[PDB]
Design an enzyme around this catalytic site. Structure first.
Site, PDB file in Angstrom:
ATOM      1  N   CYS A 140      -5.363   3.899  -1.992  1.00 30.32           N
ATOM      2  CA  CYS A 140      -4.192   4.476  -1.338  1.00 30.32           C
ATOM      3  C   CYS A 140      -3.310   5.240  -2.319  1.00 30.32           C
ATOM      4  O   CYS A 140      -2.773   6.295  -1.977  1.00 30.32           O
ATOM      5  CB  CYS A 140      -3.366   3.395  -0.641  1.00 30.32           C
ATOM      6  SG  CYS A 140      -2.884   2.024  -1.694  1.00 30.32           S
ATOM      7  N   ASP A 177      -1.228   9.157   5.482  1.00 30.02           N
ATOM      8  CA  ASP A 177      -1.591   7.802   5.104  1.00 30.02           C
ATOM      9  C   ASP A 177      -3.112   7.654   5.129  1.00 30.02           C
ATOM     10  O   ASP A 177      -3.738   7.831   6.172  1.00 30.02           O
ATOM     11  CB  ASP A 177      -0.943   6.826   6.082  1.00 30.02           C
ATOM     12  CG  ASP A 177      -1.104   5.395   5.657  1.00 30.02           C
ATOM     13  OD1 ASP A 177      -2.245   4.972   5.405  1.00 30.02           O
ATOM     14  OD2 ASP A 177      -0.084   4.684   5.575  1.00 30.02           O
ATOM     15  N   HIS A 211       0.766  -1.241   0.000  1.00 34.26           N
ATOM     16  CA  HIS A 211       0.000   0.000   0.000  1.00 34.26           C
ATOM     17  C   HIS A 211       0.804   1.303   0.000  1.00 34.26           C
ATOM     18  O   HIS A 211       1.830   1.424   0.678  1.00 34.26           O
ATOM     19  CB  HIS A 211      -1.039  -0.046   1.129  1.00 34.26           C
ATOM     20  CG  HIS A 211      -0.807   0.938   2.225  1.00 34.26           C
ATOM     21  ND1 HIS A 211       0.194   0.790   3.160  1.00 34.26           N
ATOM     22  CD2 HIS A 211      -1.469   2.070   2.560  1.00 34.26           C
ATOM     23  CE1 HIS A 211       0.136   1.785   4.028  1.00 34.26           C
ATOM     24  NE2 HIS A 211      -0.865   2.577   3.685  1.00 34.26           N
TER      25      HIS A 211
END
Lengths: 224, 78
Positions: free
Chosen positions: A183, A130, A113
């Protein structure tokens, strides 16, 4: 309804069937193939080709728009640094002075990710974002360390580590992804916004359109 | 065939190549690709952090003898 009927078609063709390897956009020594652009399909995981390329369009955008001097690291940077320390990447910034920049974007590829780290020379600060609410504790340290070396190495001088700080954006501070595939898009959009000193106001809900917009932006090496 | 390069990979897998500074590096990649049996597009060659294009050249990139050409694998994330 903000995407032109025509553009729609263009975006459609890039994503449709055709030779995977067919090149569709060339720049920054990158050849975006139909196969790469595919990663932008809904629920599809973005790959390095797309990201590095987008990351570059951002610099050009900032450049022709008058936004902060933006410098971008390759998706391969952090990983390499991580394993081999400063020596492994020492010649990675040969033709340039990091500290003369204003904002440094470092794409972070963690197992499975994408994440992002923003270094703001202007405010002596490292920021870790994030969309899956992770922590950049160690990551930030490694990067800061990197800076200490590059400075002492490239301009023979320590960094005043006292005036430096690194916050890890918590889930309630930035938009989080709702499906397990964006992501990459988040990393990309976070960057887009941050590089313009623009406050992040988008949500997971825009990501689907963003995806489409990106492919257009890529084929025309021009951000919208 | 003027220079000798070391094409190293993420798992430390080295492979030497003698190449003509006069020529494109695409050739060097194609051979590395098969000598490994890995699809072209699944690989990325860099020299000192700089991605090596196909028509790129040893003389262009200014590679001295026994220089390393690093190889990386496609990345993806969710």
């Amino acid at each position: 309804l903000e995407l032109t009927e025509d553009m729609e078609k263009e975006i459609s063709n890039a994503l449709g069937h055709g030779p995977q390897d067919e090149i569709l956009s060339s720049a920054f020594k990158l050849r975006i193939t139909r196969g790469d652009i595919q990663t932008l399909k809904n629920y599809h995981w973005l790959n390095d080709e797309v990201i590095n390329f987008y990351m570059n369009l951002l610099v050009e955008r900032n450049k022709k728009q008058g936004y902060p001097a933006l410098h971008v690291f390759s998706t391969f940077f952090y990983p390499k640094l991580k394993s081999g320390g400063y020596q492994a990447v020492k010649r990675w910034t040969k033709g340039v002075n990091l500290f003369e920049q204003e904002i440094i974007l470092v794409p972070i590829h963690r197992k499975v990710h994408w994440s992002l780290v923003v270094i703001d020379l202007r405010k002596k600060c490292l920021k870790y974002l994030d969309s899956m609410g992770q922590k950049g504790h160690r990551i930030c340290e490694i990067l800061l360390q990197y800076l200490q070396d590059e400075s002492k190495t490239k301009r023979n001088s320590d960094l005043n580590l006292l005036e430096w700080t690194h916050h890890s954006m918590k889930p309630h501070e930035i938009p989080q992804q709702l499906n397990g595939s964006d992501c990459g898009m988040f990393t990309c959009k976070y960057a887009d916004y941050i590089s313009r000193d623009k406050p992040i106001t988008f949500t997971q809900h825009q990501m689907p359109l963003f995806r489409k917009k990106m492919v257009w932006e890529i084929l025309h090496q021009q951000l919208l | 065939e003027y220079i000798k390069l070391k094409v190293i990979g993420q798992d430390s897998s080295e492979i030497h190549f003698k190449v003509k500074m006069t020529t494109h590096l695409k050739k060097l990649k194609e051979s590395y690709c098969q000598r490994q049996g890995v699809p072209m597009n699944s690989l990325r060659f860099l020299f000192e952090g700089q991605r090596i294009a196909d028509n790129h050249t040893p003389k262009e990139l200014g590679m001295e003898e026994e220089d390393v050409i690093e190889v990386y694998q496609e990345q993806t994330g969710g």
